[PDB]
Amino acid sequence: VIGDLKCNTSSINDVDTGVPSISSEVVDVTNGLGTFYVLDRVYLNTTLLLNGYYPISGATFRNMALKGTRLLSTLWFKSPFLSPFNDGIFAKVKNSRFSKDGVIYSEFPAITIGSTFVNSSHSIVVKPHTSFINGNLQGLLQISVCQYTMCEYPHTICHPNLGNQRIELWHYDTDVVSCLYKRNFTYDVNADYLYFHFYQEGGTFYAYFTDTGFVTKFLFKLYLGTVLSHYYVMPLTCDSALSLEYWVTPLTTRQFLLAFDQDGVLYHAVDCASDFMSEIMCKTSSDP
């Protein structure tokens, strides 16, 4: 259970489909993976020791993507899918460009980040939305942070052209609710992978994003004043045979040594707390 409202409680079984897939690759940041750009600041032809919310070198990712057709498992909405959100998380999300009847699409899972997922708290929801404008497929990314009455079994659905045996249903507030924040963000539907930093500090939530390269740019920030404790990558139901990936590794507060081209491109990094070599390599930045 995520919310605590028995919504459209049909086509649900208790089927064990296993546990989120572990990546064969670990976090290695030795040229950018897991780093972000500084908001309203651009460094050229220089290194820079920097504290921040970075993923842990040697840590694996987990594929939190859940793909359904009609049936949802009750086990999909518990640990280990309903996961702890501490400092933050880093996401490598695949843009599933399923090709059907000539046209190419752009599906990937929604993620909700909250405390209790009840209308008494706020919950962040980062949901993709696709639509055609004269047969050209457009990418949106509907961010919203609201006092949602979340369902026990929240799921999104794919584009209706790919076929759906379920209606989209994650919250039941067809009555208009109190929201701290909501705006849409366009993304390039021709992107191989989308990357996200989601972290919190002193009651403020932070989001970084990129649909080009792996190094994320700043997206938005929002003062909650509360402390976020959980994330859930929602199952996406579809008739078409999509191949979903939402790869997540957690963030902790760490010092990194970053490096920039003359064109301001972060091209190299050192996980400074990973290694006795790395520690030595950073601390030696004070005038020798």
Ligand X SMILES: *[C@@H]1O[C@H](CO)[C@@H](O)[C@H](O)[C@H]1NC(C)=O
Ligand Y SMILES: *[C@@H]1O[C@H](CO)[C@@H](O[C@@H]2O[C@H](CO)[C@@H](O)[C@H](O)[C@H]2NC(C)=O)[C@H](O)[C@H]1NC(C)=O
Q: What residues make contact with ligand Y under the rule CB under 6 A? A: 4-5, 118-119, 129, 140, 142, 149, 173, 182-184
For residue 247, which of 203, 202, 195, 205 has the smallest C-alpha distance?
Answer: 195
Q: Which does 142 bind (CB under 5 to 8 A by kind): ligand Y, ligand X, none?
A: ligand Y
Is residue 167 near ligand X by the rule CB under 6 A? yes
Rounded to whole angstroms, the Cα distance separating 186 from 19 reads 32
Q: Does 13 bind ligand X (CB under 6 A)?
A: no
The residue among 60 and 69 lying less far from ligand X, judged by its C-beta, is: 69
Query: What is the distance between the alpha carbons of residues 241 and 88, in angstroms, rounded to a whole number?
Result: 31
- Comparison of 45 and 51: residue with beta carbon closer to ligand X: 45
For residue 262, state whether it binds ligand X (rule: CB under 6 A).
yes
Residue 10 touches which member of ligand Y, ligand X, none, C-beta under 5-8 Å by kind: ligand X
**CA 269 – CA 45 distance, rounded (Å):** 14
Contact 22, 240 (CB under 8 A): no
- Name, in order, each residue with C-beta under 8 angstroms of 105's C-beta and a sequence gap of 6 or more: 96, 97, 98, 99, 130, 137, 158, 159, 161, 162, 240
Give the nearest distance from C-beta 185 to ligand Y in angstroms.
9
Q: Which does 167 bind (CB under 5 to 8 A by kind): ligand Y, ligand X, none?
A: ligand X
CB 203 within 8 A of CB 228: no
Q: CB-wise, 45 or 131, nearer to ligand X? A: 45
What Å distances lie between residue 227 and 47, 116, 144, 168, 270, CA to CA? 33, 11, 17, 28, 30
Residue 41 contact among ligand Y, ligand X, none, beta carbon within 5 to 8 Å by kind: none
Q: Where are the beta strands (DSSP E) in 224-265?
A: 230-233, 236-237, 246-260
- Binding partner of residue 11 among ligand Y, ligand X, none, CB cut-off 5 to 8 Å per kind: ligand X
Task: Determine the size of the site formed for ligand X (CB under 6 A).
Answer: 7
* Block residue for tokens 């690759």: 25
Task: Compute the least distance from the CB of residue 243 to ligand X, in Å.
Answer: 22
Nearer Cβ to ligand X, position 189 or 234? 234
Instruction: Catalog residues that contact ligand X under the rule CB under 6 A.
Output: 8, 10-11, 45, 166-167, 262
